[PDB]
Amino acid sequence: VAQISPQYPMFTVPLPIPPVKQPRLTVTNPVNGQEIWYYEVEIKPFTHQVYPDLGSADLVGYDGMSPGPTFQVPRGVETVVRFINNAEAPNSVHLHGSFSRAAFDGWAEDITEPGSFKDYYYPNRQSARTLWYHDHAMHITAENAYRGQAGLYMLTDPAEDALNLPSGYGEFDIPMILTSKQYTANGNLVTTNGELNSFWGDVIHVNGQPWPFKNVEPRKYRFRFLDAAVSRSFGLYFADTDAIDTRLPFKVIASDSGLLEHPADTSLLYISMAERYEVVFDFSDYAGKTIELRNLGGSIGGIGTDTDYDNTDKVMRFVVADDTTQPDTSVVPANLRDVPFPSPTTNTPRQFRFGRTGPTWTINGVAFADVQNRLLANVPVGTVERWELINAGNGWTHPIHIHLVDFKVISRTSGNNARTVMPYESGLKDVVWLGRRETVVVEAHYAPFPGVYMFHCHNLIHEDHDMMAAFNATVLPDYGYNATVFVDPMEELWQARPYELGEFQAQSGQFSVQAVTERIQTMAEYRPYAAAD
Ligand SMILES: *[C@@H]1O[C@H](CO)[C@@H](O[C@@H]2O[C@H](CO)[C@@H](O)[C@H](O)[C@H]2NC(C)=O)[C@H](O)[C@H]1NC(C)=O
Numbered sequence: 251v252a253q254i255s256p257q258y259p260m261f262t263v264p265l266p267i268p269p270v271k272q273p274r275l276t277v278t279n280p281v282n283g284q285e286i287w288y289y290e291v292e293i294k295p296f297t298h299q300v301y302p303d304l305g306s307a308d309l310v311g312y313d314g315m316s317p318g319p320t321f322q323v324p325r326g327v328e329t330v331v332r333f334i335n336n337a338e339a340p341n342s343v344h345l346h347g348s349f350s351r352a353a354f355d356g357w358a359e360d361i362t363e364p365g366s367f368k369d370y371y372y373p374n375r376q377s378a379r380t381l382w383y384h385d386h387a388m389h390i391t392a393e394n395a396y397r398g399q400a401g402l403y404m405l406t407d408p409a410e411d412a413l414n415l416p417s418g419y420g421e422f423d424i425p426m427i428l429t430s431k432q433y434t435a436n437g438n439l440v441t442t443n444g445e446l447n448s449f450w451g452d453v454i455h456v457n458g459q460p461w462p463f464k465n466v467e468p469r470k471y472r473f474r475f476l477d478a479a480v481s482r483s484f485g486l487y488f489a490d491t492d493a494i495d496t497r498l499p500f501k502v503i504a505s506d507s508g509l510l511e512h513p514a515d516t517s518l519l520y521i522s523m524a525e526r527y528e529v530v531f532d533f534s535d536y537a538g539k540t541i542e543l544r545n546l547g548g549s550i551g552g553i554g555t556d557t558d559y560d561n562t563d564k565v566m567r568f569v570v571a572d573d574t575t576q577p578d579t580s581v582v583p584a585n586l587r588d589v590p591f592p593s594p595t596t597n598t599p600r601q602f603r604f605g606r607t608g609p610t611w612t613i614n615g616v617a618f619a620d621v622q623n624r625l626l627a628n629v630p631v632g633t634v635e636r637w638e639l640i641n642a643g644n645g646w647t648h649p650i651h652i653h654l655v656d657f658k659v660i661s662r663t664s665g666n667n668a669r670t671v672m673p674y675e676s677g678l679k680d681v682v683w684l685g686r687r688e689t690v691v692v693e694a695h696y697a698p699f700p701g702v703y704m705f706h707c708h709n710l711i712h713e714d715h716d717m718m719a720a721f722n723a724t725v726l727p728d729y730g731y732n733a734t735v736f737v738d739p740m741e742e743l744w745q746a747r748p749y750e751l752g753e754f755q756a757q758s759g760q761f762s763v764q765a766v767t768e769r770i771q772t773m774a775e776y777r778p779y780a781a782a783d
C-alpha cells in the first residue's frame with residue numbers, strides 16, 4: 251500500500267539511545283533499614299524535529315523525551331517514582347512486567363490530572379528482565395503512549411552478570427524499542443483520535459527514530475526488542491543488503507519475564523505489542539557488510555492482519571566495521587537459568603473470548619467502561635489457573651496481557667494451521683499473541699499479592715474501545731499483611747496529589763528532602779511487599 255507519510259531519508263540518522271534515569275536520592279526504610287531509591291519524572295510536552303526539512307512534531311513524554319529515560323534497578327532495591335503530570339491530559343503510569351500492588355499498577359481509572367503527581371512504590375523483587383513503563387489512562391491510552399509516554403525499566407541481577415552475555419548499556423547491550431507512526435505533510439504526527447479498528451502506521455521507528463542506522467563491530471551484540479507500537483505486530487529477520495532473500499540466524503535469550511532456560515536458535519522472530527525478547531546477534535561473520543533488520547510482509551506471514559506499506563518492510567541498518575577495537579570476550583552459554591515455572595495444573599481452563607460486540611472490541615462481550623460487569627474472574631491468591639484465550643476471527647489479532655502474573659504458554663492451535671507454540675515462548679511471558687483464528691492456553695500463578703488487576707489486549711486501539719477487563723486475586727479477611735489498604739486500586743491513601751510548579755522547580759515544599767523523606771518512610775511502614783519476603 252502506498253506510503254501516506256512524506257518520504258524520509260532512510261538510514262541516515264544514527265540510532266539514539268535513551269539516557270539512563272538516575273534517582274534523586276535514597277530514603278532509609280524505617281522497617282528494615284535499607285535504602286529506597288527515589289526518582290522524579292515530569293510528564294511534559296516537547297517538540298521534536300523528525301523530518302529534517304519539514305516542520306516539527308508535537309510529543310508528550312516522561313522528562314520531555316521519547317522514549318522516556320531508561321531505569322536500571324538491581325533486584326532487592328525498592329524504588330519510589332514520583333510521576334509529575336505537567337501536561338494537558340490525564341495520566342496513569344503502568345510498570346509492565348512488575349507485580350506491583352493494585353494501587354501502584356496503573357489501574358486505568360487511577361488517574362493523575364495535570365497539576366498533580368502520584369508516588370509509585372515498586373518492589374523490584376522479581377527475576378531480571380526488561381520491563382517498560384507507559385501510560386494506561388482509561389480511553390486515551392492509545393494517544394498518550396503514541397505521543398511518547400513509554401520507556402524502559404531494566405531489572406538487573408548480579409548472578410546474571412556471571413553469564414558474561416554481551417554487555418554495557420549503549421555499548422554492546424542495546425535497547426530496540428519499535429514503534430510505528432504516521433506523519434502529516436508538514437512533518438507533524440498524525441493523531442490516533444478517530445481510529446477505532448487499528449492504527450498501523452507507515453513509518454517504522456527504533457528508539458524514537460524512523461529507519462535508523464547503526465555502526466557496529468564484527469562481534470556479538472545483545473538486543474532488547476520491545477514492540478511498543480499502537481497496533482503493529484512484527485516478524486523480524488536479519489539479512490545482508492546484498493542478499494535480502496536469506497535470513498541470518500541468531501539466538502533468543504529472553505522473553506517478557508526473563509531468560510529462557512537455553513538460547514533458542516531462530517531466524518524469524520514474531521513479536522507483538524507489549525512483547526519483549528532479547529536477542530544476541532553475531533556480526534563476526536559479516537565484517538564489512540551492511541545488515542538490514544527487516545519486517546516480514548503479508549501481514550506477518552499471515553499471522554496478523556496489519557496493513558503493509560511501501561517501507562514497513564524495513565526497520566533499520568547495521569553497518570559492520572572491518573574489525574573490532576578490542577577482542578569479543580563475551581559468550582552465549584547453553585544454560586541460562588532454571589526457569590521458575592508455575593506448579594502445573596490440569597483444572598479446566600477459564601475461557602475468554604476476544605471479539606466484537608456491535609461496534610465495540612470486547613472480552614466475553616463486555617467493555618471496560620461497564621463498571622458493573624468488567625470483573626470477570628475471582629482467583630484466590632496462591633492459585634495456579636490455566637486460561638484459554640480465544641480469538642475466533644480472521645479479521646483481527648490480539649496480543650493478550652495479564653497484569654500481576656508471569657505465565658507459561660501451554661499451547662496454540664491455529665484455525666489456519668499456521669503455527670503452534672514457538673521455541674522463544676518456552677519460558678515465562680506476560681503477553682501472548684493470538685493470531686488469526688488462534689486459541690492459546692496459558693498457565694499462571696496468581697500470587698503473591700491480593701488485589702484488583704487488569705487484563706486486556708495490548709493493541710491500544712482495541713484496548714481503548716474497549717477490550718479490557720479485570721480480575722480479583724482474593725484472600726480471606728484473616729490474611730493480614732495490610733491487605734485491606736492494598737486491594738482497591740482507587741484507595742484514597744495512594745491517590746494523586748496537587749502540587750505547585752514553583753514547589754517542584756525549587757525542590758521545596760512537597761518536594762523538599764524532608765517532605766519526600768517523611769512521605770516515603772510512611773508508605774514503607776505499610777509493608778506492601780512483605781508477602782514476597
Ligand atoms: C477483591 O477481593 C477483596 C479481597 O478478597 C475484597 O475485599 C473484601 O471485601 C469484603 C466485602 O466488602 C470485606 O469484608 C473484606 O474485608 C475485604 N477484604 C479485604 C482484604 O479488604 C474486594 O471487595 C474485592 N474487590 C472487588 C472490587 O470485588
Ligand SMILES: *[C@@H]1O[C@H](CO)[C@@H](O[C@@H]2O[C@H](CO)[C@@H](O)[C@H](O)[C@H]2NC(C)=O)[C@H](O)[C@H]1NC(C)=O
Pocket residue numbers: 281730731732772774775776777780
Ligand atoms: C500495616 O500498616 C501500618 C501503618 O503503616 C503499620 O503500623 C505502623 O507501624 C509503624 C512502624 O512499624 C508504627 O510506628 C506506627 O505507629 C504504626 N501505625 C499504625 C496505625 O499502627 C503496620 O505495622 C502494618 N502491618 C503489617 C502487618 O504490615
Ligand SMILES: [Cu+2]
Pocket residue numbers: 344346384524651708
Ligand atoms: Cu503494557
Ligand SMILES: [Cu+2]
Pocket residue numbers: 344345346347651652653654
Ligand atoms: Cu502490564
Ligand SMILES: [Cu+2]
Pocket residue numbers: 646647648649707708709712713717
Ligand atoms: Cu485486540
Ligand SMILES: [Cu+2]
Pocket residue numbers: 344386651653704705706
Ligand atoms: Cu495493562
